[PDB]
């Protein structure tokens, strides 16, 4: 709801990644409906996920990614989380900032 996503698109993408190590960020984004929202909307999203309002998604917030979308969802695994940063952390700081986030949702 925070980023204008359908209960339904969210239910379907969580299903697709219900198994540990099955999460693929690119796919999730597209299936949740994220990849077709406006940049404003991509920005609201970044802001909820960054729970502490640090202006960065820290690897502990990343671990809880899916929980943002649905409270009963599973935590991401270490290899899931590693792969996320690996492709989104472009400056090498170990965090995903707003610009790095939008960049990964884009394509
Ligand atoms: Ca944060
Ligand atoms: Ca970074
Ligand atoms: N954090």
UniProtKB/Swiss-Prot annotation:
InterPro entries: EF-hand-dom_pair, EF_Hand_1_Ca_BS, EF_hand_dom, Parvalbumin
UniProt keyword terms in alphabetical order: Acetylation, Calcium, Metal-binding, Muscle protein, Repeat
Pfam families registered for this protein in UniProt: EF-hand_7
Positions with a binding annotation for Ca(2+) 1: 50, 52, 54, 56, 58, 61
Binding, Ca(2+) 2: 89, 91, 93, 95, 100
Classification via SMART domains: EFh
Any single Gene Ontology cellular-component annotation: cytoplasm
Organism superkingdom: Eukaryota
Residues annotated as domain EF-hand: 37-72, 76-107
Residues with PTM N-acetylserine: 1
GO molecular function terms listed in the Swiss-Prot or TrEMBL record: calcium ion binding
Family to which the UniProt record says this protein belongs: Belongs to the parvalbumin family.
Additional free-text comment from the UniProt record: This is one of two major parvalbumins found in the white muscle of pike.
Function field: In muscle, parvalbumin is thought to be involved in relaxation after contraction. It binds two calcium ions.
Record's protein name: Parvalbumin beta
């Amino acid at each position: 709801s925070f980023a204008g996503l359908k209960d339904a698109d969210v239910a379907a993408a969580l299903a697709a990644c219900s198994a540990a190590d099955s999460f693929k960020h690119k796919e999730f984004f597209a299936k949740v409906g994220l990849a077709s929202k406006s940049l404003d909307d991509v920005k609201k999203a970044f802001y909820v996920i960054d729970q502490d309002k640090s202006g960065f998604i820290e690897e502990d917030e990343l671990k809880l990614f899916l929980q943002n979308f649905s409270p009963s969802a599973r935590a991401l695994t270490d290899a899931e989380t590693k792969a996320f940063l690996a492709d989104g952390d472009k400056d090498g700081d170990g965090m995903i900032g707003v610009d790095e986030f939008a960049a990964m949702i884009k394509a």
